[PDB]
Amino acid sequence: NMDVIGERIKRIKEEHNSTWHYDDENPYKTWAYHGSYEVKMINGVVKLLTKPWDVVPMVTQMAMKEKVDTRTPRPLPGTRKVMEITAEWLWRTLGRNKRPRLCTREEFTKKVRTNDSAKAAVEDEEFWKLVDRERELHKLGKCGSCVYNMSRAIWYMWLGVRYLEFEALGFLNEDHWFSRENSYSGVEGEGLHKLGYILRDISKIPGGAMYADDTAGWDTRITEDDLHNEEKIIQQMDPEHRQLANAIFKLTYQNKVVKVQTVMDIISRKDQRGSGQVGTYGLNTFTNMEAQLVRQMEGEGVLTKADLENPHLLEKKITQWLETKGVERLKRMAISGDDCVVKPIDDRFANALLALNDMGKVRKDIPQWQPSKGWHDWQQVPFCSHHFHELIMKDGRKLVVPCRPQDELIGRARISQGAGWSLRETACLGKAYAQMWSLMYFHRRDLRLASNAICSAVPVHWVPTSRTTWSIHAHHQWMTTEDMLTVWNRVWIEENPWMEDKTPVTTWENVPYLGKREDQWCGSLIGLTSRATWAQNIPTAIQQVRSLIGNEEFLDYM
Ligand X SMILES: COc1ccc(CC(=O)O)cc1-c1cccs1
Binding residues are 134, 138, 143, 146, 387, 403, 522
DSSP state of 373: P
Site residues (CB under 5 A) for Zn ion, limited to 142-161: 143, 146
Maximum CA extent, the chain: 79
State the pairing for strand pair 148-149/256-260. Answer: parallel
Burial of 188 (0-12, 13-18, 19+ CB in 10 A): buried
φ, ψ for residue 341, nearest 5 deg: -120, 135
Site string for ligand X, 334-373 (x = CB under 6 A): ----------------------------------------
> In angstroms, what is the minimal distance from the CB of 436 to ligand X?
6
Q: How far apart are CA 352 and CA 126, in angstroms?
A: 54
- Kindly indicate which of the ranges 233-241, 370-378, 465-473, 495-503 contains the residues binding ligand X, using the contact rule CB under 6 A: 465-473
Q: How far apart are CA 346 and CA 210, in angstroms?
A: 10
Burial of 106 (0-12, 13-18, 19+ CB in 10 A): exposed
61 or 320: CB nearest ligand X: 61
Q: Pick what 385 binds: Zn ion, ligand X, none; C-beta below 5 to 8 Å, kind-dependent.
A: ligand X
Site residues (CB under 6 A) for ligand X, limited to 399-438: 412, 436
Looking at the DSSP bridge assignments, the partners of residue 32 are 268
Among 149, 385, 481, 530, binds ligand X (CB under 6 A): 385
> In angstroms, what is the minimal distance from the CB of 194 to ligand X?
11
399 or 440: CB nearest ligand X: 440
121 or 458: CB nearest Zn ion: 121
> In angstroms, what is the minimal distance from the CB of 77 to Zn ion?
33
Among 235, 471, 530, 544, binds ligand X (CB under 6 A): 471
Does residue 264 belong to the site contacting ligand X (CB under 6 A)?
no
DSSP state of 53: G
393 or 522: CB nearest Zn ion: 522
Q: How many Cα atoms sit within 13 Å of 74 on the Cβ side? A: 8
Size of the site for ligand X (CB under 6 A): 11
Q: Pick what 146 binds: ligand X, Zn ion, none; C-beta below 5 to 8 Å, kind-dependent.
A: Zn ion
Among 456, 473, 505, 531, binds ligand X (CB under 6 A): 473
Burial of 53 (0-12, 13-18, 19+ CB in 10 A): buried
Site residues (CB under 6 A) for ligand X, limited to 183-222: 192
Burial of 279 (0-12, 13-18, 19+ CB in 10 A): buried
190 or 225: CB nearest ligand X: 190
Q: How far apart are CA 499 and CA 477, in angstroms?
A: 18
302 or 440: CB nearest ligand X: 440
Q: With beta carbons less than 8 A apart as the criterion, state whether 541 and 51 touch.
A: yes
Count the neighbouring beta carbons within 10 Å of the beta carbon of residue 176: 16
Q: Pick what 248 binds: Zn ion, ligand X, none; C-beta below 5 to 8 Å, kind-dependent.
A: none
Does residue 469 belong to the site contacting ligand X (CB under 6 A)?
yes
Q: With beta carbons less than 8 A apart as the criterion, state whether 447 and 401 touch.
A: no
Among 68, 393, 423, 474, binds ligand X (CB under 6 A): 474
* Torsion from C-alpha of 18, 23, 26, 28, nearest 10 degrees: 100
Site string for ligand X, 135-174 (x = CB under 6 A): ----------------------------------------
90 or 400: CB nearest ligand X: 400
Q: With beta carbons less than 8 A apart as the criterion, state whether 361 and 372 touch.
A: no
> In angstroms, what is the minimal distance from the CB of 384 to Zn ion?
14
391 or 542: CB nearest ligand X: 391
Does residue 384 belong to the site contacting ligand X (CB under 6 A)?
yes
- Kindly indicate which of the ranges 98-106, 150-158, 168-176, 467-475 contains the residues binding ligand X, using the contact rule CB under 6 A: 467-475
* Binding-site entries for Zn(2+): 134, 138, 143, 146, 387, 403, 522
Count the neighbouring beta carbons within 10 Å of the beta carbon of residue 376: 10
Q: How far apart are CA 121 and CA 158, in angstroms?
A: 11
* Torsion from C-alpha of 208, 371, 379, 322, nearest 10 degrees: -50
Site residues (CB under 5 A) for Zn ion, limited to 379-438: 403
φ, ψ for residue 540, nearest 5 deg: -60, -55
- Kindly indicate which of the ranges 123-131, 163-171, 269-277, 468-476 contains the residues binding ligand X, using the contact rule CB under 6 A: 468-476
Burial of 32 (0-12, 13-18, 19+ CB in 10 A): middle
Name the residues that contact Zn ion, by CB under 5 A: 134, 143, 146, 403, 522
Name the residues that contact ligand X, by CB under 6 A: 192, 384-385, 412, 436, 440, 469-471, 473-474
